Structure formats: C-alpha cells, structure tokens
C-alpha cells in the first residue's frame, strides 16, 4: 500500500582500519579499529582529553568506547560510524517513490532537496499547498505524486475559518448561513 515506511538505514562502511593504520592519518573516516585488543568500528576525532590518561580507554554510561588516549600522545573522541536513516515514500497508484533521509543534511547525500525533516531524493520542490495529504512527511510537509512524474514536495495548508469582525458599537456582526445541506 501507499505510504511512508521506514526501511533499513544506509550503512556507513569502513574506509580503512587503525591498529595499535595510524589514527591521526584517518581522522574523520569510518574505520575498523583494533586498539590493544579492543575493537569495533568508528570515527576518530581530535578532541579535548577527558577521563584518566593512564587508563587509555574512555567509556560512556552505556559502556561504549567513546574516547581513546593514543600512544602518539593525542586524545581522540570515538564516534560510531553512523548510519544514515532511510524512509521510503511510495505511491502504489503511480508506482513511484522518493527517499527521505531523515535528520540528514544533504551534504552527505534533480539533485537532493533539503527539507525541514531531512534530505529527500526523488521529490521536486513545488511551492504548492494541499489539504488532502496522503503521504505526510512530517512537520507540515507532504509528498504529492505527479498524476507518472516525480513526486512534488507540497506544504500542508492551514484552512482559515471565516473571519468575522467585532464591532466598536452596541451591535454585533452575525455570520449566519443562507444555505444548507445535509451530510453524513
């Protein structure tokens, strides 16, 4: 069925490895690491030292390795290689789709469109409003199929009520029906 669905994230993959292959030469990259028997995947960053230096490995409150004192004298922060969220925007009738990378700036991904909910590929910005949104993206955004073409990025309209002014007087304005219908 048509809808917006979460699917497996787009995985970051190692671009190399560090072993204590030096850390300083691969900062900012996702690498596999093996540091004095401690291993996993992550991204090293140069940062301010925390924790006790003599203990080498700095852990967080969930027992993840979050920092490391290297034998080259530097302290590095360790971040997980982070996956890139993926949501599929799909329209069954048109057999078309768009991909939303929620929370992701497009610098990591028509070209990609940056929206209030993440980076989206497959949508074209339309500066169009809808009330009748079937594929809400979040915030007040909606994917609108072209019908097939590309899905449009539409904004959901606020439907304003009839404005009835108050009077500076002893009288008042009455907004009153002149017609009617029945509905179910």
């Amino acid at each position: 069925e048509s809808g917006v669905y979460s699917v497996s994230s787009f995985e970051a993959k190692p671009s190399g490895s560090v072993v204590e292959t030096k850390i300083a030469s691969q900062l900012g990259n996702c690498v596999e690491y093996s540091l004095y028997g401690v291993s996993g995947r992550g991204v090293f960053q140069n940062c301010t030292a925390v924790g006790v230096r003599q203990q080498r490995f700095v852990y967080d409150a969930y027992q993840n390795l979050v920092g490391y004192y290297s034998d080259d004298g530097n302290y590095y922060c360790l971040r997980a290689c982070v996956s890139v969220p993926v949501s599929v925007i799909y329209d069954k009738e048109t057999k078309t789709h768009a991909t939303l990378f929620g929370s992701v700036a497009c610098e990591h991904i028509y070209g990609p469109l940056q929206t209030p909910v993440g980076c989206v590929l497959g949508l074209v910005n339309s500066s169009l409003f809808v009330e009748d949104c079937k594929l809400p993206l979040g915030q007040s955004l909606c994917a609108l199929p072209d019908t097939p073409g590309e899905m449009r990025l539409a904004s959901i309209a606020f439907n304003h009520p009839i404005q009835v002014d108050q009077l500076n007087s002893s009288y008042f304005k009455l907004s009153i029906p002149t017609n009617f219908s029945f509905g179910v």
Partner: protein
C-alpha cells in the same frame, strides 16, 4: 483548573536487523531462523505510528473553527487575555514549552549535529539513534500549524458558545460573552452590571496568577513533563540494552566471532539475539500500549475542546472545578 491531555506519543521506528545484529553476517544468518521477526517489528511500529498521524488529524479537524474573529492586541477588552494572544505561539504556550525539559530530536539535521558536536550529555538518546539503530520520526504537523489551530480556536470562543445551533457566529466581545456565561450560571444581571469592573479584575487575577504557575506544585505541569519523560524512557530501553550480554561472553558480536569457533560462537551469538529480540518485543508492546492510550486520550481532548472550549459546560467536574465559565487551549 489546569489540565494536560496527552494526544500523541513520540513516533519511533527501529532498524531491527541492525539493532540485533549490527551488520554481522553470522548473526543475520542465525536471525533468519527466528522467522520474519523484523518484519513484525516494523509493521507493528508502522501501524502504531500511523495511529498518531490519524489521531492528530482527527483531533485537529475537530478543534478547527468554521468561523472565527481575528485576534487583535486588546482582544478580551477589560479581560486580560494577552497571555493567550499569539506573540506564532502565545506567551503561556511558549512558557509551557520553555519550562519543560525536552531533548531536541534534530529533525532537519540531527545526524550531523551528533557528529560535529557529539552527544550533549551522558545517555543522550537523540545521538543514540544513529548508533543503536532507531529513529525518532517528526510529528504530523509543524509548530506553526498547531499554533494556527489554537489561535483560530481562541478567536472563536466568544461567538461560538452563544446561542442555538453550531452554524452561525456571533462576533461579540469577549467581555460580553463572559457576562452571558455568568448570567447563565445564576448571577443576576443587576449584579453583573454593578460589578463589571470587579468581575474583570477577578478574572484577570485568576489568569495572571497562572503566569508563574509552571512549577513544582502544578500537577498539570508535571503531567506535561511526565509525558516527555515517558518518551525518553521508551528510547532508553533501546539505547541501554545493547550493552547487555544476556549470559554471553561479550555484548559484541565481533568479539564472539573473533574468539570462538562456530559450534560455540553460534551459542553466544544466539544469546545476544534472544536478548535483543526480547528487548524489541517489549519495546513494541509498549509502543502499542502507549499509542492506544494516547489515542483514547486524544478523544478525551476532542471532547473537551467541544464541551469546554467551544461551549460553556454544565457538567460538574468535566472541565474544571467549580462552575465552568470559559476554557482556553494551547
């Protein structure tokens, strides 16, 4: 009487395959023997998440006014409603949000904030998303749209709860509405006429007194914080359970593979799988319980807007305590 009604829960999806196996093929191979586990996790949450978008859509469709007067500075006349006038959210509404501690989910670029700045503190459940394998999804409506709904609601109050039928709108002063509301509960017109300034002053004291009310003694206010804390707890289960070994030699699949051969390696990976499958089932069961509760609550909110806000209620205790006169919503 202040009251908080929860209408939604935070919507979360889980990359179950990543959560359980962390990209390790041996684990994925063993995970397959548990059937379409992850399909069930994803479908259960997808349905639970649709439920809030439907709940929200229905709730706002009902708060929505047909006809409304514009809010202008001075709205309220002698009745001080500046607290409620849009500054756009109202002043009380911004205060309510500023006083509640809420982590910023980073809907537009959180992925990057957690890399260039890193976690805000210990146990940061927003940055945990990209590590643990879960995602916090954005709400159906942005803030300005929700503000638009309650702003149009404010402007409809005086002219909606006035006479027979729901079809016409009387664009009358707020103050005039209050006096009809007071007359309707047993205060005579001679009294209201002699005391109009006294009444406006008491009304103003009642609302002015509330500006400093978002504190430790405000039960409705704690309920707002608790709804927030419940969302955090739901995410903490996923963030905190991946460090458990569930009897295994390590919480790391990679350590198990590196240390053991298949006949034992299998048993150890399997312990981690069972623990993680259990965790995800518990998570999903709670998202379904919490989304069911929020949906019922949303219907209560719907009834209060229609009974309380768009009308003067004659039901003791339904709205606030004492005799109901007028209600507002932010």
């Amino acid at each position: 009487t202040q009251e908080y009604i929860q209408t939604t829960i935070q919507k979360v999806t889980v990359d179950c395959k990543q959560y359980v196996c962390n990209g390790f093929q041996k684990c994925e191979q063993l995970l397959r023997e548990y059937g379409q586990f992850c399909s069930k996790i994803n479908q259960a949450l997808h349905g639970a998440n649709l439920r809030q978008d439907d709940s929200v859509r229905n709730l706002f469709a009902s708060v929505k006014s047909s006809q409304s007067s514009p809010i202008i500075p001075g709205f309220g006349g002698d009745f001080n409603l500046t607290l409620l006038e849009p500054v756009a959210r109202s002043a009380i509404e911004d205060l309510l949000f500023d006083k509640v501690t809420i982590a910023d989910p980073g809907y537009m670029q959180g992925y990057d904030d957690c890399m260039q700045q890193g976690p805000a503190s210990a146990r940061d459940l927003i940055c945990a998303q990209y590590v643990a394998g879960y995602k916090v999804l954005p709400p159906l409506m942005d803030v300005n749209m929700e503000a638009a709904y309650t702003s149009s609601l404010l402007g409809s109050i005086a002219g909606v709860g006035w006479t027979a039928g729901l079809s016409s709108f009387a664009a009358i002063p707020f103050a005039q509405s209050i006096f009809y509301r007071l007359n309707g509960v047993g205060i005579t017109q001679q009294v209201l006429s002699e005391n109009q300034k006294l009444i406006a002053n008491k009304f103003n004291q009642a609302l002015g007194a509330m500006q400093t009310g978002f504190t430790t003694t405000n039960e409705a206010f704690q309920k707002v914080q608790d709804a927030v804390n419940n969302n955090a707890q739901a995410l903490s289960k996923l963030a905190s359970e991946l460090s458990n070994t569930f009897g295994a030699i390590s919480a790391s699949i990679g350590d198990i593979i590196q240390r053991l051969d298949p006949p034992e390696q299998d048993a150890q990976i399997d312990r981690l799988i069972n623990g993680r499958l259990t965790t995800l089932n518990a998570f999903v069961a709670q998202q379904l319980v919490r989304s069911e509760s929020a949906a019922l609550s949303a219907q209560l909110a719907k009834d209060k807007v229609n009974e309380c806000v768009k009308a003067q209620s004659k039901r003791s205790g339904f709205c606030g305590q004492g005799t109901h006169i007028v209600s507002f919503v932010v």
